[PDB]
Amino acid sequence: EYTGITYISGPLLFVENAKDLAYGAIVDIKDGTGRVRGGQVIEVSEEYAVIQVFEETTGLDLATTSVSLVEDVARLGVSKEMLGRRFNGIGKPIDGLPPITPEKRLPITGLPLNPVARRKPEQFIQTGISTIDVMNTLVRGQKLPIFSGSGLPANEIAAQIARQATVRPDLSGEGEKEEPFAVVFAAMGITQRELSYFIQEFERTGALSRSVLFLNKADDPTIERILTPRMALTVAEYLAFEHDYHVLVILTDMTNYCEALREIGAAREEIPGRRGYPGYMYTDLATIYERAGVVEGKKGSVTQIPILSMPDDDRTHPIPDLTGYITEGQIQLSRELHRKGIYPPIDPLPSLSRLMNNGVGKGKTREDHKQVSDQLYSAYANGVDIRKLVAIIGEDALTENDRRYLQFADAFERFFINQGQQNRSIEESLQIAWALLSMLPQGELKRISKDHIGKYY
């Protein structure tokens, strides 16, 4: 215990000596204005240990202060009735109804994952927005960032896929007792618009019977934004591996993560500027995207599905750049088709799907799933390509081996990309994909050969 303080400050402050303060310990501080705070004890000194201030500088005095150790490190309960319930907020969750009993109290720091305790994917996620899960092949063995960008909404898209993920015994690879209707959402910081949007979405999706959504509530202090990710996570790591279930962490915008994070880096005098946003970013993120693999010797996983927007419709900013590097490849949506009406607009022109033939096969999804993967990609690609070089030399440059690739981009357009919010099975997608692969002469195709031609028309 330590009475007296010698620095009143907003992000970090002086606590004389130390002899039992752990790293990342929970302390309780009565401010003497009748208020109480906590924090982590990250950095411990026999000179001045500095403690994580959990709220603004106002409402502090030296008339009455005490620092008192509550626990060694951070810890919190994980109920087995956590699934099928929304637990908004953190510490004491205010989801506006009573909190669920902390049945197993374990650490919420993170539990690491051995790199030799991993195994190659074998699960597919059948989600109702065809276009992605066909070409990009949404599997749990990839963690591709979905980039919304400016004037493209991050919410609508995330909102969509919520109820629209479904489970089959073997059109999804694994079983439907190996995949529940449960999912987990972890906020990297929600904002005004982001919250005022998901209000209606809870009562419609079923955040009382199939979804867990930890939030920051958009109005809790900054340091909360570096707490909820990894807290949200660890919870799910338990019921996933040890209890056996597949859950997907559907993240939200990492912009507000940087936001909060940065203020610590200029009040400790670290490297908080890589190109205007932290140079220390990735170090803390090691843990988030470490469990986003596939376990070996247990069944069920955890996969981070980053969903993050960009401060500009150019990537000169560290926001999407440092994320690219960290993680693997990209999936995007852009605004090419959004200006015209298409919804959901999906442009995977500069995309990279790392895996697309692993975690699916033939008979794990469908036969022609493995073949029609790369096909659509370059068929469509070379559609948009024409419209480039026509206009360069007068207003035409097209051939008869162009008129077919041309219309393969119309055929892919409003027929396939546009769909409303209407659930589509992997069957309904690939089946009819082959009648749109009847706009170019079949038999000898770029990636397909005669082995699915005469079977799927």
Binding site: Y7, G10, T33, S150, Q192, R193, D219, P272, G273, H317
Partner: protein, 577 residues
């Protein structure tokens, strides 16, 4: 309480010891001159003090008398129709004690306490109060104002005066259980009143400008922005907004505003006329605006003040209409203060704590249901005023996601005298999605159906004018003609308005709704005209077009009868040919 002595004087910031066991935020008298200051972050037995005013011959080691109690915002009668500043002091009592030019060591109160304000009670002796709903009201001639006692202040009330005019300082009530109050109540500056549920806007948007609210609804409890520099045709929106718009109260606020342009507004403020109040707008308008002819820390203290006071009104079931002008320029001050500290700029030429207080500003403002169960709305219009129009400045690329709507006006669109001048390809409102339920529910059934549909006009007209109708529309297809035939009605009816004529600028749901409606029913008949091969000489000379025009020169009175005749006229003028 406390008394200290100065240690350093580093420009307008001061460092002073002798202040230990202090309470954060104080009225503070720096020296014997009496430069207005605030005790902030202590260290050891000395502290950092941010002193709003300048020095010019303050010795080191002088006496510093300070309150030793937290400064809170004071709220009571005289808030409505009183001139104030962002420090929570009345600007008129300053002018009266400083003359033409501000003098140092002149401090004033925090409320209009020298005036004897009307009173009538709403509680009676030996009854308990409920916080956050009522206490008793002040009937002000200008606008009604319910002086209520904040939440979690329970316990019996004793001696409640009846009707009469009573000074702020004099009691009109007292509490039986002690902690007797007068008419002035104190709330901590950055503490926000808790809520019973989050809510979502569903109150229809009308600002008195066609395209402005009818295409882009943002509703009451939305958060907007108007980018580019303020002035040069941008004033149109800001002025007209509070005149027409459905809000009960108006709050105006500056933080680095212009010179002559910041005074044109004040002076023309009472001559702007509200129809509910039927005279002076200044009646239901609260002023707390700050310019750079006010102290250093003026602009840095600005926000929180205004934010709080808005929540007061919210609580009484009154919608407020806040205008957080010169957001960009707010940070000027913050930066200056933070130089002199360890909280140095580290982002992109501005604080990284810029990010926190900009965000939070919007997260405390919306439609919600307070603890007393009354609902208000705390709509913000975001004049940012960046120097280029750039996104690589902090202020813009942060607001851009946080607040979901951007309302760009173009200079060209403005210069022809057809208002609003809103450039559509450069405006957006991500709000519209979630409001489409609540729009059709309360307003009109086919209301959404009109907006989304009709907008296709501008889109096929934008790339049509360019250089494709260079050769006249008569040498083009009859389907590409059709676009300018409808084009007349959209540009002379549904986008033309005057801020000089008050019989057309007063608009509401029912007027705007029929206008957009007629242009659907005129496209449905235009396109049936070209399918029958009806000439584009006689359709451009129909009485039908003129019948729209006369119904934008009446506010909403003659509108119902003119819709009876006007609708059916379209019907029998394509059938008369």
């Amino acid at each position: 309480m406390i008394q200290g002595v100065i240690q350093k004087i580093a420009g307008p910031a001061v460092i002073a010891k002798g202040m230990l066991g202090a309470r954060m935020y104080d009225i503070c008298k720096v020296g014997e001159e009496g430069l207005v200051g605030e005790i902030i972050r202590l260290d050891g037995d000395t502290a950092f003090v941010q002193v709003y005013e300048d020095t010019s011959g303050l010795k080191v080691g002088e006496p510093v008398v300070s309150t030793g109690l937290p400064l809170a915002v004071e709220l009571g009668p005289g808030m409505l129709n009183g001139i104030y500043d962002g420090i929570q002091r009345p600007l008129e009592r300053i002018r009266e004690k400083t003359g033409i030019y501000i003098t140092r060591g002149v401090v004033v109160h925090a409320l209009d306490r020298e005036k004897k304000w009307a009173w009538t009670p709403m509680v009676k002796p030996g009854d308990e109060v409920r916080g956050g709903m009522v206490l008793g009201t002040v009937p002000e001639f200008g606008f009604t104002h319910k002086i209520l006692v904040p939440p979690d202040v329970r316990g019996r009330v004793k001696e409640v005066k009846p009707a009469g005019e009573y000074t702020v300082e004099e009691p009109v009530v007292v509490l039986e259980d002690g902690t007797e109050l007068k008419m002035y109540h104190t709330w901590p500056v950055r503490r926000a009143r808790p809520v019973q549920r989050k809510l979502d806007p569903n109150t229809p948007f009308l600002t008195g400008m066609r395209i402005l609210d009818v295409l882009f609804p943002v509703a009451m409890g939305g958060t907007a922005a108007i980018p580019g520099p303020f002035g040069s045709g941008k004033t149109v929106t800001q002025q007209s907004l509070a005149k027409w718009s459905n809000a009960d109260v108006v709050v105006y606020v500056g933080c680095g505003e212009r010179g002559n342009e910041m005074t044109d507004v004040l002076v023309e403020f009472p001559e702007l006329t509200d129809p509910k109040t039927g005279g002076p707008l200044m009646h239901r308008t609260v002023l707390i605006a700050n310019t750079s002819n006010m102290p250093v820390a003026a602009r840095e203290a600005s926000i929180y003040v205004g934010v709080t006071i808005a929540e007061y009104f919210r609580d009484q079931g009154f919608s407020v209409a806040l205008m957080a002008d010169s957001t960009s320029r707010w940070a000027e001050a913050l930066r200056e203060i933070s130089s002199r500290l360890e909280e140095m700029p580290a982002e992109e030429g501005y604080p990284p704590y810029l990010a926190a207080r900009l965000a939070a500003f919007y997260e405390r403002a919306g439609k919600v249901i307070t603890l007393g169960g009354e609902e208000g709305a705390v709509t913000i219009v975001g004049a940012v005023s960046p120097p280029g129009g750039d996104m690589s400045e902090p202020v813009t690329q942060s607001t851009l996601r946080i607040v979901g709507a951007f309302w760009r006006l173009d200079a060209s669109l403005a210069f022809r005298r057809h208002f609003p001048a809103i450039n559509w390809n450069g405006s957006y409102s991500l709000f519209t999605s979630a409001l489409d339920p609540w729009y059709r529910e309360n307003v009109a059934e086919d209301y959404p159906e009109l907006r989304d549909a009709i907008s296709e006009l501008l889109q096929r007209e934008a790339g049509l004018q360019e250089i494709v109708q260079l050769v006249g529309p008569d040498a083009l297809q009859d389907a590409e003609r059709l676009v300018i035939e409808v084009g007349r009605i959209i540009r002379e009816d549904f986008l033309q308005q005057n801020a000089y004529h008050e019989v057309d600028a007063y608009c509401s749901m029912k007027k705007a709704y029929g206008i957009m409606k007629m242009i659907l029913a005129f496209y449905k008949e235009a396109e049936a005209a070209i399918k029958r091969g009806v000439s584009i000489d006689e359709i451009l000379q129909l009485p039908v077009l003129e019948r729209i025009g006369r119904a934008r020169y009446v506010s909403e009175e003659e509108f119902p009868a003119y819709f009876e005749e006007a609708m059916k006229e379209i019907q029998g003028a394509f059938k008369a040919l």
